[PDB]
Design a binder for this molecule. Structure first.
Ligand SMILES: FC(F)(F)c1ccc(CNc2ccc(Cc3c[nH]c4ncc(Cl)cc34)cn2)cn1
Length: 327
């Protein structure tokens, strides 16, 4: 019998509880709208896009999904036959939360599902550049400064510049604002959980069971879970408190990764009792090299120990939209 926090960090929808508190919704209670049902036969599977112990995501072709006589590339999340009922429930619950959330430009969107007969298939948008973290890392050496000739890079047209990084930061804040408006808390926001598509649109996601979490050292064995500690707010680490404001903390850590072009957070600071002490005492990362001062300012406010002093995603969107206008 699996403890699911060992295998993924589940997003949560919250509902108003007593007084000013929120409580988690049990996602198995959410409805699955059968308008999403899509014939299993009209799918043709290609390469695997990610896999963990019990789940995988694989690229596929779907016949007639969006237009009656047209095919389109999609990504399909599904479980391996060795999965347990606890994973099969988690995947249906993920489908129910997707059916509840609706559609947004900056999330990986639900396109359809196969829920009768064999395994649950969750059909979502395919993003051809893959995860943003790997993209930033392979694009790292070709990042180009403002007033520099295009002739110095080979693929200057495919290179990375500050305009891209500000754009990615803006689109992720917009996706997170959407999530928060549906009372959704992601709980595992990070560049590894953001995809990049045609036109360089970023889409938030979570590989979840399709990630080999035991071999991703960004997840630390803490209690009986595997937790992305370096991305988490202190209240989540120490009191297991997850709110819209803890997502903002993670967004600040994402910004640091983004403007460091995929560097790993808190270098020279392995997760141990020393790490936890320094975070409590107010240690915070310095500005990434390519981060403009105003983006580093957002980062610092994202990391306020007092959750009420952190920006909301709605405010962050306003801030970054203005920074983009002014340049
Ligand atoms: F809305 C959000 F909160 F952002 C959200 C959306 C979806 C999910 C979980 N659903 C999924 C499903 C598949 C994937 C992986 C994936 C897809 N399209 C892709 N295109 C390319 C590649 Cl290489 C990987 C993928 C990630 N998350 C979690 N959170």
């Amino acid at each position: 019998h699996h403890h699911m926090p060992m295998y993924e960090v589940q997003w949560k929808v919250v509902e108003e509880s007593n007084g000013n508190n929120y409580s988690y919704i049990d996602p198995t209670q959410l409805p699955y709208d059968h308008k999403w049902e899509f014939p299993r036969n009209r799918l043709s599977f290609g390469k695997t896009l990610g896999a963990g112990a019990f789940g995988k995501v694989v690229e596929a072709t779907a016949q007639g999904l969006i237009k009656s006589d047209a095919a389109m590339t999609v990504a399909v999340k599904m479980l391996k036959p060795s999965a347990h009922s606890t994973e099969r429930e988690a995947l249906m619950s993920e489908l129910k939360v997707l059916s509840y959330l609706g559609n947004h430009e900056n999330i990986v969107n639900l396109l359809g599902a196969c829920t009768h007969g064999g395994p649950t298939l969750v059909i979502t948008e395919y993003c051809c550049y893959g995860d943003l973290l790997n993209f930033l890392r392979r694009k790292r050496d070709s990042f180009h400064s403002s007033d520099t000739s295009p002739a110095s890079m080979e693929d200057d047209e495919n290179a990375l510049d500050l305009e891209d990084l500000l754009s990615f930061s803006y689109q992720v804040a917009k996706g997170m604002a959407f999530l928060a408006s549906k009372n959704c808390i992601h709980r595992d926001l990070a560049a590894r959980n953001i995809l990049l598509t045609h036109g360089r649109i970023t889409k938030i996601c979570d590989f979840g069971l399709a990630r080999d979490i035991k071999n991703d050292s960004n997840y630390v064995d803490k209690g009986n879970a595997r937790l992305p500690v370096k991305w988490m707010a202190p209240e989540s680490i120490f009191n297991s408190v997850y709110t819209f404001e803890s997502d903002v903390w993670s967004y600040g850590i994402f910004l640091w990764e983004l403007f460091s072009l995929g560097s790993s957070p808190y270098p020279g600071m392995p997760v141990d009792s020393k790490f936890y002490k320094m975070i409590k005492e107010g240690f915070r990362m310095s500005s990434p090299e390519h981060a403009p001062a105003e983006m580093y300012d957002i980062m610092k406010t994202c990391w306020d120990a007092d959750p009420d002093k952190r920006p909301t995603f709605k405010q962050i969107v306003q801030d970054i939209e203005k920074q983009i206008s002014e340049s």
